[PDB]
């Protein structure tokens, strides 16, 4: 299939609070993974017809990508900082879910999701 549009990062009649946690998000933790030189394949949506990939959103029914959190984080989308660290599992758990135990796109995300945890486990 193609791809479906982005998830959503902009609500306008949501009300926005911005917190010590999710200031956290940004500047620390989107900010240190984002520089992480295995980040690149997880800055933006898969796209499914450039890597040819028909099933990917057949199998990913949650897509979600850092690209997405960064514009989410930005535009305070979040209200909770859960709602982030769980955009940032459901991010993790579809690279999990697509793709196989040792595969090599595996090992990136293992990586990242273990700077990602020790991050989160110093949350202010
Ligand atoms: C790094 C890489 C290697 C090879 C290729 C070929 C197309 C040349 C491109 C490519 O670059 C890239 N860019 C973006 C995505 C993925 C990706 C993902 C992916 C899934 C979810 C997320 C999310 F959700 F966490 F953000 C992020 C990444 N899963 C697999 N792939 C590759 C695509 C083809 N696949 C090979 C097939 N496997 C099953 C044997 C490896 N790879
Ligand atoms: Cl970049």
């Given amino acids: 299939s193609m791809n479906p549009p982005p998830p959503e990062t902009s609500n306008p009649n949501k009300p926005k609070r911005q917190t010590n946690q999710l200031q956290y998000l940004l500047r620390v933790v989107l900010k240190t993974l984002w520089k992480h030189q295995f980040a690149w394949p997880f800055q933006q949506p898969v ?6 990939l028909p099933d990917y959103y057949k199998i990913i029914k949650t897509p979600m990508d850092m690209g997405t959190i960064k514009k ?5 989308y979040y209200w909770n900082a859960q709602e982030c660290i769980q955009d940032f599992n459901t991010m993790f758990t579809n690279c999990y879910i697509y ?26």
Avoid: C, H, S, Y
Wanted: glycine share 2%; aromatic share 2%; hydrophobic share 45%.
């Fill in 47 to 52: 796209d499914a017809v450039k890597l040819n």
């Fill in 72 to 76: 989410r984080l930005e535009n305070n």
């Fill in 99 to 124: 793709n196989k135990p040792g595969d090599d796109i595996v090992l990136m995300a293992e990586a990242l999701e273990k700077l990602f945890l020790q991050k989160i486990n110093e949350l202010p």
